[PDB]
Design an enzyme around this catalytic site. Structure first.
Site, PDB file in Angstrom:
ATOM      1  N   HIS A   1       0.875  -1.296   0.000  1.00  0.00           N
ATOM      2  CA  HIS A   1       0.159  -0.237  -0.051  1.00  0.00           C
ATOM      3  C   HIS A   1       1.001   1.213  -0.084  1.00  0.00           C
ATOM      4  O   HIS A   1       0.199   2.359  -0.039  1.00  0.00           O
ATOM      5  CB  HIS A   1      -0.987   0.089   1.216  1.00  0.00           C
ATOM      6  CG  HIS A   1      -0.385   0.242   2.426  1.00  0.00           C
ATOM      7  ND1 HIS A   1      -0.657  -0.652   3.532  1.00  0.00           N
ATOM      8  CD2 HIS A   1       0.070   1.484   2.840  1.00  0.00           C
ATOM      9  CE1 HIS A   1      -0.026  -0.248   4.549  1.00  0.00           C
ATOM     10  NE2 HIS A   1       0.504   0.943   4.498  1.00  0.00           N
TER      11      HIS A   1
ATOM     12  N   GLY B   1       3.502   5.733  10.255  1.00  0.00           N
ATOM     13  CA  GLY B   1       4.753   5.374   9.691  1.00  0.00           C
ATOM     14  C   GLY B   1       5.512   4.167  10.084  1.00  0.00           C
ATOM     15  O   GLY B   1       6.393   3.808   9.651  1.00  0.00           O
TER      16      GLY B   1
ATOM     17  N   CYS C   1       4.235   0.974   9.494  1.00  0.00           N
ATOM     18  CA  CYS C   1       4.044  -0.039   8.362  1.00  0.00           C
ATOM     19  C   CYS C   1       5.641  -0.511   7.723  1.00  0.00           C
ATOM     20  O   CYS C   1       6.324   0.287   7.511  1.00  0.00           O
ATOM     21  CB  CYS C   1       3.141   0.436   7.226  1.00  0.00           C
ATOM     22  SG  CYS C   1       1.541   0.528   7.803  1.00  0.00           S
TER      23      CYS C   1
END
Ligand code: A1AGZ
Lengths: 300, 300
Positions: B40, B142, B144
């Site tokens: 993503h 932030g 991920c």
């Protein structure tokens, strides 16, 4: 909200194995010096009343075997500073980080890198107890494991591990070799003074539980600082100082809960208990998160 | 006497990078000449509400991906998508690549999380995979691409990569082949975790831990079939046991001489009868986030 240790890589690259006789523990290799607990020089006999200067003068550099991984480091000199031995070696550690040696205060937290035979095994967060013990997880061979904080790229070493007490808590020194607490590096069963609960940390944690939408323990009341402290000391909680109140500002602003209002919630919990309820997962009030810790983990 | 204890994180720190597409930056894992990250990263906020990943990916070229270790750019020479992870081929093999593998863990298994922001580690802590395929992480914007792992000998087994936070504040993600744990999808849509259950295999590990420490009031003279125990346990919101669960309790069964199914009978009585005011390892609550491996690793 989780009990979070600092990333340990900068410290892992400093851990080595130190052997003297049939004793093996861990050492911390910084530039060209290896720091380790001096009781590595004690024999089964020595350990009950070791005259360390006398035992150390009888040792030669070649009595110390230092290994980093597969490689042995040649000890070219040694000295003692309080309860730490400093082994000068012929090679500089290229993995030496930017560092400093600090002595921490009770209530302050730090990360422990538990090591065995010079190899890192686990990392966890601990606090210096008001009675200068630490509730660690340390087994045979863990001595020379260190505790630390990281700020930017600087590792502040604050703890080196030396011993376990009969109650299962732990004691050690700063990196100048001075013990935290009234303990001594001789093979005797030693009790600590009475421990207390770190009150400013419990308050930080209650504030953490509110940032995470947990607020069942709040109440509409307030308390003066001195009345709160009267109740705290009754329950063997540390007194809360105005500096502590000041330190809690950011958490207070964030949640809009005045410090002395949260003190009134904590007073209620001490008097009434938790009544089955739990807070941030815990049936007990948690006291090994500092204000800074809570913020650092609501910050990034 | 037990702590959540993470694995030393240095080997994983040496693999963390950042991956940016436009203004969206998350973390990637650099192993040999491949960087793994959540797909993503290729989505704008509008794409996130409902993305066509195949079409978003066709529009992308190697030169749209900014991969950095620190501030040093790593040139991307290829890209592909495997389930919900992006694999970015880079022109440099990571000199710090450890021995490693990719494993998909079962509910109840624990692992260490190295929480990272902009490619920089902030903290390490232990998580358990819940039966509803969520973890109680400590993750901010932030984070991920932060990964979860276990270390066996010198081998890092990567088992988790972080992708999202659910409405209730628990966390979900994929294995390193990009297959989500649980039924979740990488879309900015309303998703909910199943109701969670207690991790039976870990409670049993905890009872074995208590016995190892001499705390054994709860052992009874009886036994049960696995089927009868499972049917009772589900009535208390406990997970049924699998054969693999019975097997990973093997070492602790052997260490104590208490057959797994006898321990199950003791747990059944605690469920049906309660603690009656007593404690186990100092607590009225049964712990379910220590695996049999965690127990041995801290007891032995
Ligand atoms: C160094 O690796 C070692 C780490 C200990 C071993 C078990 N857990 C630890 O953290 N440190 C020691 O062995 C010190 C050496 C002394 C010379 C300082 N001693 C020590 O920790 O001790 C062991 C504990 C076990 C509980 C206890 O009472 N005791 C002291 C002695 C005397 C009294 C009877 C038991 C043994």
């Amino acid at each position: 909200f989780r009990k979070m240790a600092f990333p340990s890589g900068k410290v892992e690259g400093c851990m080595v194995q130190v052997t003297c006789g049939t004793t093996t523990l861990n050492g911390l290799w910084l530039d060209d010096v290896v720091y380790c607990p001096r009781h590595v020089i004690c024999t089964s006999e020595d350990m009950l009343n070791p005259n360390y200067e006398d035992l150390l003068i009888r040792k030669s550099n070649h009595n110390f075997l230092v290994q980093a991984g597969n490689v042995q480091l040649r000890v070219i000199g040694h000295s003692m500073q309080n309860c730490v031995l400093k082994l000068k070696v012929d090679t500089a550690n290229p993995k030496t980080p930017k560092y400093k040696f600090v002595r921490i205060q009770p209530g302050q937290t730090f990360s422990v890198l538990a090591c065995y035979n010079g190899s890192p095994s686990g990392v966890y967060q601990c606090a210096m107890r008001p009675n200068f013990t630490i509730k660690g997880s340390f087994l045979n061979g863990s001595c020379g494991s260190v505790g630390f904080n990281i700020d930017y790229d600087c590792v502040s070493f604050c703890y080196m591990h030396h011993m376990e007490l009969p109650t299962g808590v732990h004691a050690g020194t700063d990196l100048e070799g001075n013990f935290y607490g009234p303990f001594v590096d001789r093979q005797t069963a030693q009790a600590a003074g009475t421990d207390t609960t770190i009150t400013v940390n419990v308050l930080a944690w209650l504030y953490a539980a509110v940032i995470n939408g947990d607020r069942w323990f709040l109440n509409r009341f307030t308390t003066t600082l001195n009345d709160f402290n009267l109740v705290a000391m009754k329950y063997n909680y540390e007194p809360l100082t105005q500096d502590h109140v000041d330190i809690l500002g950011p958490l207070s602003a964030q949640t809009g809960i005045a410090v002395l209002d949260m003190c009134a919630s904590l007073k209620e919990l001490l008097q009434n208990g938790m009544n089955g309820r739990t807070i941030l997962g815990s049936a007990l009030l948690e006291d090994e998160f500092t204000p800074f810790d809570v913020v650092r983990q609501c910050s990034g």
